[PDB]
Amino acid sequence: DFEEIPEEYL
Amino acid sequence: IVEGSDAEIGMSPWQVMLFRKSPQELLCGASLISDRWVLTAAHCLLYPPWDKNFTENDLLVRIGKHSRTRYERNIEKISMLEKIYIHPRYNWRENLDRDIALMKLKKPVAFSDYIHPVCLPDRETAASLLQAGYKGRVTGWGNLKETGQPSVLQVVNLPIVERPVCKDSTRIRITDNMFCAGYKPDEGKRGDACEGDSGGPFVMKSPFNNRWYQMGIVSWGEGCDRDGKYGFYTHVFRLKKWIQKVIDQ
Amino acid sequence: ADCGLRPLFEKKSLEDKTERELLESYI
Ligand SMILES: N=C(N)NCCCNC(=O)[C@@H]1CCCCN1C(=O)[C@@H](CC1CCCCC1)NCC(=O)O
Ligand SMILES: *[C@@H]1O[C@H](CO)[C@@H](O[C@@H]2O[C@H](CO)[C@@H](O)[C@H](O)[C@H]2NC(C)=O)[C@H](O)[C@H]1NC(C)=O
Ligand code: NA
Ligand code: NA
C-alpha cells in the first residue's frame, strides 16, 4: 500500500 | 514500534527507511551517519534462514521521511546503494552476534531540516551513558502490535536493563556486543520495537554536549512488548573499530 | 562536526516532547 515513487529512482 | 507515539516533524532526522525496489515494500529501518554512509542491522540484508541476501541493486534508502507509505515530495530524498558491507563475524547462525552493516550511497545526500546525521559514540560517551536505568530512544515504521502498521514514524523511550536481567529473560546466548532495553513488569510502563523496526537506531542525548548519539541498532526480540521480555540491540560502540575501518576504507 | 544536532530542535533551541524524560533518567 505504498505510494509509487518517481521512476527516476529505478 | 509497540506502545509508542507519533514522532514530531524533524524529531529523528537521521532516520532511514530501507526500501525494496521490485516488490515495493518496507525492508527495515536504518540511520544516517554521514552524507554518504548508512548504518543498519546485518540481518536486514543477510539472513540465510529466511533466504534473505540482498545486493546493492535490490533496494533503495529513503531519507527524511515521516509518513510510512506516502512519497513525501520536496522532503524525502531517495538514494541508490553503491556498496553494502556486512560485519565479517556477524553470527546469523546462532544469536545475531555483531548484527551490524554499513551501506555506502552512490551520491552524498543533501542535509536539510529533515535530513541530518546522528553521532557515533566514543569510549567515554558509551561508558557514561550505557547504564542500567538510563533511557534511550527507538524509532521505526514497524508493527504497532506483535500480531497493524503506523501512518507515521513511531517513537518510544526505553531504559537500558542490567545484563543479568537481560540474560535471565531469554534462552538465547547474550554477548558483549548486545545490550537490552525495556521496562520490567513491575515498572508499569511499556514499549518495544517490533517486526519492521529492525536496523533502526537506539539513540541517547548526551547531557554533556547535548548531541544525539546512536548507542544501539534494533536487533532482536522474542515477541513484542511481552512482560518479562526485552528488546536486544547491537552495541554500536563495541563494533566502532570495524565501522571506522570500513569507512576509512 | 554538527552531528546529532537537529535543525528543528537543538539548532533552534527547541526541545521535543519527551527528550526531558531521557535527561531525567541520566541520574
Ligand atoms: N524488539 C523486538 N522485540 N522486536 C524487533 C526486533 C526485530 N528483529 C527480528 O525480528 C529478528 C530478525 C531476524 C530473524 C528473527 N528475529 C528475531 O528477533 C527472533 C528471535 C531470535 C532469532 C534467531 C537469532 C536470535 C534472536 N524473534 C522473532 C519474533 O519473536 O517474532
Ligand atoms: C549472498 O549473495 C552474495 C552476492 O550478493 C554471494 O556472494 C558470492 O560469493 C561468491 C564466492 O564464491 C562470488 O564468486 C560471487 O561473485 C558472489 N556474488 C554472487 C552473486 O554470487 C553469496 O554467496 C550469497 N550467499 C551468502 C551466504 O552470502
Ligand atoms: Na538465560
Ligand atoms: Na517487555
Side-chain angles (χ1 to χ4, degrees), chain B residues 8-9 11 14 112 116-117 119 134-135 137 157 183 204-205 211-212, chain C residues 1-7 9-10 16-19 21-23 25-26:
Chain B
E8 292 167 65
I9 300 302
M11 179 183 239
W14 34 78
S112 69
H116 201 77
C119 306
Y134 281 42
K135 297 178 175 184
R137 175 178 291 172
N157 303 321
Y183 291 102
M204 301 180 86
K205 178 169 177 172
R211 289 177 185 254
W212 288 89
Chain C
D2 60 327
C3 65
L5 296 174
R6 303 173 294 175
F9 292 93
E10 285 77 19
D16 67 50
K17 292 160 178 169
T18 67
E19 67 175 82
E21 178 185 357
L22 308 192
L23 177 61
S25 74
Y26 306 153

PDB file of all heavy atoms in Angstrom, chain B residues 8-9 11 14 112 116-117 119 134-135 137 157 183 204-205 211-212, chain C residues 1-7 9-10 16-19 21-23 25-26:
ATOM      1  N   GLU B   8       7.545  13.618  16.165  1.00  0.00           N
ATOM      2  CA  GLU B   8       7.283  15.000  15.791  1.00  0.00           C
ATOM      3  C   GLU B   8       8.070  15.203  14.508  1.00  0.00           C
ATOM      4  O   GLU B   8       8.987  14.440  14.215  1.00  0.00           O
ATOM      5  CB  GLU B   8       7.792  15.967  16.862  1.00  0.00           C
ATOM      6  CG  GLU B   8       7.021  15.909  18.167  1.00  0.00           C
ATOM      7  CD  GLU B   8       7.736  16.632  19.289  1.00  0.00           C
ATOM      8  OE1 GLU B   8       7.903  17.863  19.205  1.00  0.00           O
ATOM      9  OE2 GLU B   8       8.139  15.958  20.258  1.00  0.00           O
ATOM     10  N   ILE B   9       7.706  16.218  13.738  1.00  0.00           N
ATOM     11  CA  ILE B   9       8.401  16.509  12.493  1.00  0.00           C
ATOM     12  C   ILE B   9       9.859  16.865  12.783  1.00  0.00           C
ATOM     13  O   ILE B   9      10.143  17.689  13.655  1.00  0.00           O
ATOM     14  CB  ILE B   9       7.728  17.692  11.752  1.00  0.00           C
ATOM     15  CG1 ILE B   9       6.277  17.335  11.431  1.00  0.00           C
ATOM     16  CG2 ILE B   9       8.504  18.038  10.480  1.00  0.00           C
ATOM     17  CD1 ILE B   9       6.124  16.068  10.588  1.00  0.00           C
ATOM     18  N   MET B  11      12.010  15.164  14.265  1.00  0.00           N
ATOM     19  CA  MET B  11      12.451  14.612  15.545  1.00  0.00           C
ATOM     20  C   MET B  11      13.596  13.603  15.424  1.00  0.00           C
ATOM     21  O   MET B  11      14.415  13.476  16.330  1.00  0.00           O
ATOM     22  CB  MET B  11      11.267  13.950  16.246  1.00  0.00           C
ATOM     23  CG  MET B  11      11.604  13.313  17.575  1.00  0.00           C
ATOM     24  SD  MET B  11      10.173  12.489  18.259  1.00  0.00           S
ATOM     25  CE  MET B  11      10.007  13.360  19.829  1.00  0.00           C
ATOM     26  N   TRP B  14      17.922  11.572  11.258  1.00  0.00           N
ATOM     27  CA  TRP B  14      18.872  10.565  10.801  1.00  0.00           C
ATOM     28  C   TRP B  14      18.147   9.266  10.460  1.00  0.00           C
ATOM     29  O   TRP B  14      18.767   8.300  10.032  1.00  0.00           O
ATOM     30  CB  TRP B  14      19.924  10.304  11.885  1.00  0.00           C
ATOM     31  CG  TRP B  14      19.361  10.420  13.265  1.00  0.00           C
ATOM     32  CD1 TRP B  14      18.606   9.498  13.933  1.00  0.00           C
ATOM     33  CD2 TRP B  14      19.462  11.562  14.130  1.00  0.00           C
ATOM     34  NE1 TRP B  14      18.232   9.998  15.164  1.00  0.00           N
ATOM     35  CE2 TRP B  14      18.743  11.260  15.308  1.00  0.00           C
ATOM     36  CE3 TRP B  14      20.088  12.812  14.019  1.00  0.00           C
ATOM     37  CZ2 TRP B  14      18.633  12.163  16.371  1.00  0.00           C
ATOM     38  CZ3 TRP B  14      19.981  13.713  15.080  1.00  0.00           C
ATOM     39  CH2 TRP B  14      19.258  13.380  16.239  1.00  0.00           C
ATOM     40  N   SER B 112      19.160  18.741   5.323  1.00  0.00           N
ATOM     41  CA  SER B 112      18.073  19.713   5.356  1.00  0.00           C
ATOM     42  C   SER B 112      17.488  19.707   6.762  1.00  0.00           C
ATOM     43  O   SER B 112      18.066  19.121   7.678  1.00  0.00           O
ATOM     44  CB  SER B 112      16.977  19.304   4.377  1.00  0.00           C
ATOM     45  OG  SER B 112      16.329  18.126   4.840  1.00  0.00           O
ATOM     46  N   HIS B 116      19.541  14.789   8.615  1.00  0.00           N
ATOM     47  CA  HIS B 116      20.726  15.173   9.373  1.00  0.00           C
ATOM     48  C   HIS B 116      21.335  13.941  10.040  1.00  0.00           C
ATOM     49  O   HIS B 116      20.614  13.106  10.584  1.00  0.00           O
ATOM     50  CB  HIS B 116      20.326  16.200  10.435  1.00  0.00           C
ATOM     51  CG  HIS B 116      21.466  17.028  10.931  1.00  0.00           C
ATOM     52  ND1 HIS B 116      21.997  18.070  10.202  1.00  0.00           N
ATOM     53  CD2 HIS B 116      22.224  16.926  12.048  1.00  0.00           C
ATOM     54  CE1 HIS B 116      23.034  18.571  10.846  1.00  0.00           C
ATOM     55  NE2 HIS B 116      23.195  17.894  11.969  1.00  0.00           N
ATOM     56  N   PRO B 117      22.671  13.823  10.030  1.00  0.00           N
ATOM     57  CA  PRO B 117      23.334  12.664  10.640  1.00  0.00           C
ATOM     58  C   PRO B 117      23.395  12.632  12.166  1.00  0.00           C
ATOM     59  O   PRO B 117      23.479  13.669  12.830  1.00  0.00           O
ATOM     60  CB  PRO B 117      24.722  12.697  10.014  1.00  0.00           C
ATOM     61  CG  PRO B 117      24.983  14.180   9.908  1.00  0.00           C
ATOM     62  CD  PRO B 117      23.654  14.722   9.395  1.00  0.00           C
ATOM     63  N   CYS B 119      25.325  11.207  15.718  1.00  0.00           N
ATOM     64  CA  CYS B 119      26.707  10.948  16.117  1.00  0.00           C
ATOM     65  C   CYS B 119      26.926   9.499  16.533  1.00  0.00           C
ATOM     66  O   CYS B 119      25.999   8.824  16.985  1.00  0.00           O
ATOM     67  CB  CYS B 119      27.106  11.800  17.322  1.00  0.00           C
ATOM     68  SG  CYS B 119      26.855  13.556  17.181  1.00  0.00           S
ATOM     69  N   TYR B 134      19.307   4.256  32.514  1.00  0.00           N
ATOM     70  CA  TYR B 134      19.420   5.342  31.545  1.00  0.00           C
ATOM     71  C   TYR B 134      18.529   5.033  30.342  1.00  0.00           C
ATOM     72  O   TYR B 134      18.574   3.933  29.791  1.00  0.00           O
ATOM     73  CB  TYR B 134      20.882   5.502  31.110  1.00  0.00           C
ATOM     74  CG  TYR B 134      21.742   6.260  32.104  1.00  0.00           C
ATOM     75  CD1 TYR B 134      21.628   6.040  33.481  1.00  0.00           C
ATOM     76  CD2 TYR B 134      22.665   7.209  31.670  1.00  0.00           C
ATOM     77  CE1 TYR B 134      22.411   6.755  34.395  1.00  0.00           C
ATOM     78  CE2 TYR B 134      23.449   7.922  32.573  1.00  0.00           C
ATOM     79  CZ  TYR B 134      23.317   7.693  33.929  1.00  0.00           C
ATOM     80  OH  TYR B 134      24.088   8.419  34.815  1.00  0.00           O
ATOM     81  N   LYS B 135      17.724   6.003  29.927  1.00  0.00           N
ATOM     82  CA  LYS B 135      16.811   5.778  28.814  1.00  0.00           C
ATOM     83  C   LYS B 135      17.339   6.199  27.449  1.00  0.00           C
ATOM     84  O   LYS B 135      18.039   7.202  27.318  1.00  0.00           O
ATOM     85  CB  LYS B 135      15.483   6.492  29.075  1.00  0.00           C
ATOM     86  CG  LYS B 135      14.719   5.984  30.293  1.00  0.00           C
ATOM     87  CD  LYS B 135      13.443   6.785  30.515  1.00  0.00           C
ATOM     88  CE  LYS B 135      12.620   6.207  31.663  1.00  0.00           C
ATOM     89  NZ  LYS B 135      11.326   6.927  31.829  1.00  0.00           N
ATOM     90  N   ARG B 137      16.178   6.147  23.001  1.00  0.00           N
ATOM     91  CA  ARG B 137      15.001   6.316  22.154  1.00  0.00           C
ATOM     92  C   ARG B 137      15.079   5.438  20.909  1.00  0.00           C
ATOM     93  O   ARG B 137      16.089   5.430  20.207  1.00  0.00           O
ATOM     94  CB  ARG B 137      14.873   7.784  21.738  1.00  0.00           C
ATOM     95  CG  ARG B 137      13.740   8.064  20.758  1.00  0.00           C
ATOM     96  CD  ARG B 137      13.663   9.549  20.441  1.00  0.00           C
ATOM     97  NE  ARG B 137      13.203  10.311  21.598  1.00  0.00           N
ATOM     98  CZ  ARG B 137      13.181  11.638  21.660  1.00  0.00           C
ATOM     99  NH1 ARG B 137      13.618  12.360  20.632  1.00  0.00           N
ATOM    100  NH2 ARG B 137      12.736  12.239  22.758  1.00  0.00           N
ATOM    101  N   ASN B 157      10.636   5.789  24.237  1.00  0.00           N
ATOM    102  CA  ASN B 157      11.830   5.893  25.072  1.00  0.00           C
ATOM    103  C   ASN B 157      11.837   4.686  26.007  1.00  0.00           C
ATOM    104  O   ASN B 157      10.819   4.376  26.631  1.00  0.00           O
ATOM    105  CB  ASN B 157      11.814   7.186  25.890  1.00  0.00           C
ATOM    106  CG  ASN B 157      11.692   8.424  25.016  1.00  0.00           C
ATOM    107  OD1 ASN B 157      12.291   8.504  23.939  1.00  0.00           O
ATOM    108  ND2 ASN B 157      10.926   9.404  25.485  1.00  0.00           N
ATOM    109  N   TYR B 183      10.997  -1.775  29.772  1.00  0.00           N
ATOM    110  CA  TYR B 183      10.531  -1.727  31.149  1.00  0.00           C
ATOM    111  C   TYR B 183      10.282  -3.132  31.690  1.00  0.00           C
ATOM    112  O   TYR B 183      10.015  -4.063  30.931  1.00  0.00           O
ATOM    113  CB  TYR B 183       9.234  -0.919  31.248  1.00  0.00           C
ATOM    114  CG  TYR B 183       9.406   0.559  30.994  1.00  0.00           C
ATOM    115  CD1 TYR B 183       9.047   1.126  29.769  1.00  0.00           C
ATOM    116  CD2 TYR B 183       9.929   1.393  31.979  1.00  0.00           C
ATOM    117  CE1 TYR B 183       9.200   2.495  29.537  1.00  0.00           C
ATOM    118  CE2 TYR B 183      10.088   2.758  31.759  1.00  0.00           C
ATOM    119  CZ  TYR B 183       9.720   3.302  30.539  1.00  0.00           C
ATOM    120  OH  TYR B 183       9.853   4.656  30.335  1.00  0.00           O
ATOM    121  N   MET B 204      20.551   8.204  22.272  1.00  0.00           N
ATOM    122  CA  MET B 204      20.573   8.848  23.577  1.00  0.00           C
ATOM    123  C   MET B 204      21.120  10.255  23.393  1.00  0.00           C
ATOM    124  O   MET B 204      22.001  10.483  22.556  1.00  0.00           O
ATOM    125  CB  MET B 204      21.469   8.052  24.540  1.00  0.00           C
ATOM    126  CG  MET B 204      21.026   6.606  24.736  1.00  0.00           C
ATOM    127  SD  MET B 204      22.077   5.671  25.881  1.00  0.00           S
ATOM    128  CE  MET B 204      21.298   6.110  27.440  1.00  0.00           C
ATOM    129  N   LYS B 205      20.600  11.209  24.154  1.00  0.00           N
ATOM    130  CA  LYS B 205      21.083  12.578  24.032  1.00  0.00           C
ATOM    131  C   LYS B 205      22.060  12.869  25.160  1.00  0.00           C
ATOM    132  O   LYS B 205      21.689  12.851  26.333  1.00  0.00           O
ATOM    133  CB  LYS B 205      19.921  13.577  24.072  1.00  0.00           C
ATOM    134  CG  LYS B 205      20.377  15.036  23.999  1.00  0.00           C
ATOM    135  CD  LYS B 205      19.206  15.989  23.771  1.00  0.00           C
ATOM    136  CE  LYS B 205      19.672  17.452  23.779  1.00  0.00           C
ATOM    137  NZ  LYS B 205      18.579  18.386  23.372  1.00  0.00           N
ATOM    138  N   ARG B 211      24.223  16.457  22.292  1.00  0.00           N
ATOM    139  CA  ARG B 211      24.152  15.911  20.942  1.00  0.00           C
ATOM    140  C   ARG B 211      23.569  14.509  21.018  1.00  0.00           C
ATOM    141  O   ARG B 211      23.722  13.821  22.029  1.00  0.00           O
ATOM    142  CB  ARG B 211      25.543  15.820  20.317  1.00  0.00           C
ATOM    143  CG  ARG B 211      26.167  17.140  19.943  1.00  0.00           C
ATOM    144  CD  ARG B 211      27.570  16.912  19.410  1.00  0.00           C
ATOM    145  NE  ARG B 211      28.251  18.169  19.135  1.00  0.00           N
ATOM    146  CZ  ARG B 211      28.471  18.659  17.920  1.00  0.00           C
ATOM    147  NH1 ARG B 211      28.064  17.996  16.843  1.00  0.00           N
ATOM    148  NH2 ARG B 211      29.104  19.820  17.783  1.00  0.00           N
ATOM    149  N   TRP B 212      22.912  14.080  19.948  1.00  0.00           N
ATOM    150  CA  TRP B 212      22.325  12.747  19.918  1.00  0.00           C
ATOM    151  C   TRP B 212      23.346  11.734  19.429  1.00  0.00           C
ATOM    152  O   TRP B 212      24.026  11.960  18.429  1.00  0.00           O
ATOM    153  CB  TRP B 212      21.091  12.721  19.013  1.00  0.00           C
ATOM    154  CG  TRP B 212      19.917  13.434  19.604  1.00  0.00           C
ATOM    155  CD1 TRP B 212      19.614  14.757  19.476  1.00  0.00           C
ATOM    156  CD2 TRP B 212      18.921  12.876  20.469  1.00  0.00           C
ATOM    157  NE1 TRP B 212      18.497  15.060  20.207  1.00  0.00           N
ATOM    158  CE2 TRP B 212      18.047  13.925  20.829  1.00  0.00           C
ATOM    159  CE3 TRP B 212      18.682  11.592  20.977  1.00  0.00           C
ATOM    160  CZ2 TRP B 212      16.945  13.732  21.675  1.00  0.00           C
ATOM    161  CZ3 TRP B 212      17.581  11.397  21.828  1.00  0.00           C
ATOM    162  CH2 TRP B 212      16.729  12.467  22.163  1.00  0.00           C
TER     163      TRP B 212
ATOM    164  N   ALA C   1      31.756  17.275  14.099  1.00  0.00           N
ATOM    165  CA  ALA C   1      31.017  18.171  13.157  1.00  0.00           C
ATOM    166  C   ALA C   1      29.737  18.679  13.820  1.00  0.00           C
ATOM    167  O   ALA C   1      29.749  19.075  14.987  1.00  0.00           O
ATOM    168  CB  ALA C   1      30.683  17.413  11.866  1.00  0.00           C
ATOM    169  N   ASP C   2      28.639  18.680  13.074  1.00  0.00           N
ATOM    170  CA  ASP C   2      27.366  19.127  13.621  1.00  0.00           C
ATOM    171  C   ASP C   2      26.443  17.922  13.785  1.00  0.00           C
ATOM    172  O   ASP C   2      25.218  18.056  13.851  1.00  0.00           O
ATOM    173  CB  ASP C   2      26.734  20.175  12.697  1.00  0.00           C
ATOM    174  CG  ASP C   2      26.470  19.642  11.304  1.00  0.00           C
ATOM    175  OD1 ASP C   2      27.250  18.785  10.828  1.00  0.00           O
ATOM    176  OD2 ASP C   2      25.488  20.093  10.673  1.00  0.00           O
ATOM    177  N   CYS C   3      27.043  16.737  13.860  1.00  0.00           N
ATOM    178  CA  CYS C   3      26.262  15.520  14.019  1.00  0.00           C
ATOM    179  C   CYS C   3      25.455  15.574  15.312  1.00  0.00           C
ATOM    180  O   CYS C   3      25.868  16.195  16.282  1.00  0.00           O
ATOM    181  CB  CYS C   3      27.178  14.278  14.019  1.00  0.00           C
ATOM    182  SG  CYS C   3      28.356  14.111  15.416  1.00  0.00           S
ATOM    183  N   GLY C   4      24.287  14.943  15.302  1.00  0.00           N
ATOM    184  CA  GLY C   4      23.461  14.891  16.493  1.00  0.00           C
ATOM    185  C   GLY C   4      22.787  16.176  16.932  1.00  0.00           C
ATOM    186  O   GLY C   4      22.215  16.220  18.024  1.00  0.00           O
ATOM    187  N   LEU C   5      22.866  17.222  16.112  1.00  0.00           N
ATOM    188  CA  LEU C   5      22.217  18.487  16.432  1.00  0.00           C
ATOM    189  C   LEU C   5      21.123  18.670  15.388  1.00  0.00           C
ATOM    190  O   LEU C   5      21.401  18.944  14.221  1.00  0.00           O
ATOM    191  CB  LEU C   5      23.225  19.638  16.377  1.00  0.00           C
ATOM    192  CG  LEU C   5      24.342  19.546  17.422  1.00  0.00           C
ATOM    193  CD1 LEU C   5      25.361  20.664  17.187  1.00  0.00           C
ATOM    194  CD2 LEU C   5      23.740  19.643  18.821  1.00  0.00           C
ATOM    195  N   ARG C   6      19.878  18.504  15.820  1.00  0.00           N
ATOM    196  CA  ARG C   6      18.728  18.588  14.929  1.00  0.00           C
ATOM    197  C   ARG C   6      18.340  20.000  14.517  1.00  0.00           C
ATOM    198  O   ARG C   6      18.141  20.877  15.358  1.00  0.00           O
ATOM    199  CB  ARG C   6      17.527  17.892  15.580  1.00  0.00           C
ATOM    200  CG  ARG C   6      17.791  16.430  15.936  1.00  0.00           C
ATOM    201  CD  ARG C   6      16.625  15.849  16.723  1.00  0.00           C
ATOM    202  NE  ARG C   6      16.500  16.498  18.021  1.00  0.00           N
ATOM    203  CZ  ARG C   6      15.515  16.271  18.879  1.00  0.00           C
ATOM    204  NH1 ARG C   6      14.550  15.406  18.581  1.00  0.00           N
ATOM    205  NH2 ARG C   6      15.501  16.903  20.041  1.00  0.00           N
ATOM    206  N   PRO C   7      18.227  20.231  13.200  1.00  0.00           N
ATOM    207  CA  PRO C   7      17.860  21.527  12.630  1.00  0.00           C
ATOM    208  C   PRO C   7      16.598  22.118  13.250  1.00  0.00           C
ATOM    209  O   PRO C   7      16.543  23.313  13.532  1.00  0.00           O
ATOM    210  CB  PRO C   7      17.678  21.203  11.147  1.00  0.00           C
ATOM    211  CG  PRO C   7      18.735  20.176  10.924  1.00  0.00           C
ATOM    212  CD  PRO C   7      18.567  19.272  12.132  1.00  0.00           C
ATOM    213  N   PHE C   9      15.321  21.281  16.225  1.00  0.00           N
ATOM    214  CA  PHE C   9      15.302  21.261  17.676  1.00  0.00           C
ATOM    215  C   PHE C   9      16.557  21.888  18.288  1.00  0.00           C
ATOM    216  O   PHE C   9      16.558  23.087  18.571  1.00  0.00           O
ATOM    217  CB  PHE C   9      15.043  19.829  18.186  1.00  0.00           C
ATOM    218  CG  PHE C   9      13.643  19.338  17.885  1.00  0.00           C
ATOM    219  CD1 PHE C   9      13.376  18.610  16.729  1.00  0.00           C
ATOM    220  CD2 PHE C   9      12.574  19.704  18.705  1.00  0.00           C
ATOM    221  CE1 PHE C   9      12.064  18.258  16.388  1.00  0.00           C
ATOM    222  CE2 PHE C   9      11.261  19.360  18.374  1.00  0.00           C
ATOM    223  CZ  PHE C   9      11.005  18.633  17.207  1.00  0.00           C
ATOM    224  N   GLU C  10      17.625  21.120  18.475  1.00  0.00           N
ATOM    225  CA  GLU C  10      18.834  21.695  19.061  1.00  0.00           C
ATOM    226  C   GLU C  10      19.317  22.982  18.388  1.00  0.00           C
ATOM    227  O   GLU C  10      19.663  23.953  19.065  1.00  0.00           O
ATOM    228  CB  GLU C  10      19.979  20.677  19.065  1.00  0.00           C
ATOM    229  CG  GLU C  10      19.828  19.601  20.136  1.00  0.00           C
ATOM    230  CD  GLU C  10      18.812  18.541  19.756  1.00  0.00           C
ATOM    231  OE1 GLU C  10      18.494  18.426  18.553  1.00  0.00           O
ATOM    232  OE2 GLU C  10      18.344  17.816  20.659  1.00  0.00           O
ATOM    233  N   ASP C  16      12.029  18.581  22.035  1.00  0.00           N
ATOM    234  CA  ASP C  16      10.905  17.769  21.605  1.00  0.00           C
ATOM    235  C   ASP C  16      10.127  17.388  22.865  1.00  0.00           C
ATOM    236  O   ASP C  16      10.601  17.607  23.979  1.00  0.00           O
ATOM    237  CB  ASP C  16      11.361  16.546  20.767  1.00  0.00           C
ATOM    238  CG  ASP C  16      12.150  15.522  21.555  1.00  0.00           C
ATOM    239  OD1 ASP C  16      11.694  15.105  22.636  1.00  0.00           O
ATOM    240  OD2 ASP C  16      13.229  15.109  21.064  1.00  0.00           O
ATOM    241  N   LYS C  17       8.934  16.834  22.691  1.00  0.00           N
ATOM    242  CA  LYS C  17       8.060  16.495  23.808  1.00  0.00           C
ATOM    243  C   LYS C  17       8.501  15.477  24.850  1.00  0.00           C
ATOM    244  O   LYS C  17       7.940  15.445  25.948  1.00  0.00           O
ATOM    245  CB  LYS C  17       6.692  16.073  23.263  1.00  0.00           C
ATOM    246  CG  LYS C  17       5.930  17.216  22.612  1.00  0.00           C
ATOM    247  CD  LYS C  17       4.846  16.706  21.688  1.00  0.00           C
ATOM    248  CE  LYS C  17       4.062  17.858  21.075  1.00  0.00           C
ATOM    249  NZ  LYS C  17       3.181  17.384  19.971  1.00  0.00           N
ATOM    250  N   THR C  18       9.495  14.656  24.540  1.00  0.00           N
ATOM    251  CA  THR C  18       9.895  13.644  25.507  1.00  0.00           C
ATOM    252  C   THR C  18      11.382  13.551  25.814  1.00  0.00           C
ATOM    253  O   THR C  18      11.792  12.692  26.599  1.00  0.00           O
ATOM    254  CB  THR C  18       9.416  12.242  25.052  1.00  0.00           C
ATOM    255  OG1 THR C  18      10.112  11.860  23.858  1.00  0.00           O
ATOM    256  CG2 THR C  18       7.912  12.257  24.766  1.00  0.00           C
ATOM    257  N   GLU C  19      12.199  14.415  25.224  1.00  0.00           N
ATOM    258  CA  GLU C  19      13.627  14.319  25.489  1.00  0.00           C
ATOM    259  C   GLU C  19      13.971  14.555  26.953  1.00  0.00           C
ATOM    260  O   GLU C  19      14.981  14.052  27.441  1.00  0.00           O
ATOM    261  CB  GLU C  19      14.422  15.270  24.587  1.00  0.00           C
ATOM    262  CG  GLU C  19      14.217  16.751  24.841  1.00  0.00           C
ATOM    263  CD  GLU C  19      15.128  17.593  23.978  1.00  0.00           C
ATOM    264  OE1 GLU C  19      14.791  17.831  22.793  1.00  0.00           O
ATOM    265  OE2 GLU C  19      16.192  18.000  24.484  1.00  0.00           O
ATOM    266  N   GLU C  21      12.520  13.312  29.433  1.00  0.00           N
ATOM    267  CA  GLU C  21      12.411  12.010  30.096  1.00  0.00           C
ATOM    268  C   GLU C  21      13.776  11.315  30.045  1.00  0.00           C
ATOM    269  O   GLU C  21      14.186  10.634  30.993  1.00  0.00           O
ATOM    270  CB  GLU C  21      11.354  11.141  29.394  1.00  0.00           C
ATOM    271  CG  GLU C  21      11.190   9.740  29.989  1.00  0.00           C
ATOM    272  CD  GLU C  21      10.232   8.865  29.192  1.00  0.00           C
ATOM    273  OE1 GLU C  21       9.644   9.367  28.208  1.00  0.00           O
ATOM    274  OE2 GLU C  21      10.070   7.674  29.543  1.00  0.00           O
ATOM    275  N   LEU C  22      14.489  11.497  28.935  1.00  0.00           N
ATOM    276  CA  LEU C  22      15.804  10.892  28.794  1.00  0.00           C
ATOM    277  C   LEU C  22      16.762  11.545  29.783  1.00  0.00           C
ATOM    278  O   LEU C  22      17.447  10.857  30.541  1.00  0.00           O
ATOM    279  CB  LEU C  22      16.341  11.069  27.369  1.00  0.00           C
ATOM    280  CG  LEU C  22      15.423  10.640  26.218  1.00  0.00           C
ATOM    281  CD1 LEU C  22      16.231  10.619  24.930  1.00  0.00           C
ATOM    282  CD2 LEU C  22      14.828   9.273  26.492  1.00  0.00           C
ATOM    283  N   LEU C  23      16.803  12.875  29.772  1.00  0.00           N
ATOM    284  CA  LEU C  23      17.685  13.617  30.665  1.00  0.00           C
ATOM    285  C   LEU C  23      17.447  13.245  32.127  1.00  0.00           C
ATOM    286  O   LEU C  23      18.396  13.013  32.882  1.00  0.00           O
ATOM    287  CB  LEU C  23      17.489  15.129  30.475  1.00  0.00           C
ATOM    288  CG  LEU C  23      18.293  16.053  31.406  1.00  0.00           C
ATOM    289  CD1 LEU C  23      19.784  15.825  31.211  1.00  0.00           C
ATOM    290  CD2 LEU C  23      17.943  17.504  31.114  1.00  0.00           C
ATOM    291  N   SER C  25      16.490  10.561  33.328  1.00  0.00           N
ATOM    292  CA  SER C  25      16.939   9.204  33.641  1.00  0.00           C
ATOM    293  C   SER C  25      18.458   9.142  33.810  1.00  0.00           C
ATOM    294  O   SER C  25      18.993   8.177  34.355  1.00  0.00           O
ATOM    295  CB  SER C  25      16.512   8.225  32.541  1.00  0.00           C
ATOM    296  OG  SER C  25      17.306   8.388  31.374  1.00  0.00           O
ATOM    297  N   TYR C  26      19.160  10.169  33.345  1.00  0.00           N
ATOM    298  CA  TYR C  26      20.616  10.175  33.458  1.00  0.00           C
ATOM    299  C   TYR C  26      20.995  10.726  34.826  1.00  0.00           C
ATOM    300  O   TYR C  26      21.573  11.804  34.941  1.00  0.00           O
ATOM    301  CB  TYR C  26      21.236  11.020  32.334  1.00  0.00           C
ATOM    302  CG  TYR C  26      20.787  10.621  30.939  1.00  0.00           C
ATOM    303  CD1 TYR C  26      20.765  11.552  29.895  1.00  0.00           C
ATOM    304  CD2 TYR C  26      20.400   9.306  30.653  1.00  0.00           C
ATOM    305  CE1 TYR C  26      20.369  11.183  28.602  1.00  0.00           C
ATOM    306  CE2 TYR C  26      20.001   8.928  29.362  1.00  0.00           C
ATOM    307  CZ  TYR C  26      19.989   9.875  28.343  1.00  0.00           C
ATOM    308  OH  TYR C  26      19.583   9.517  27.069  1.00  0.00           O
TER     309      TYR C  26
END
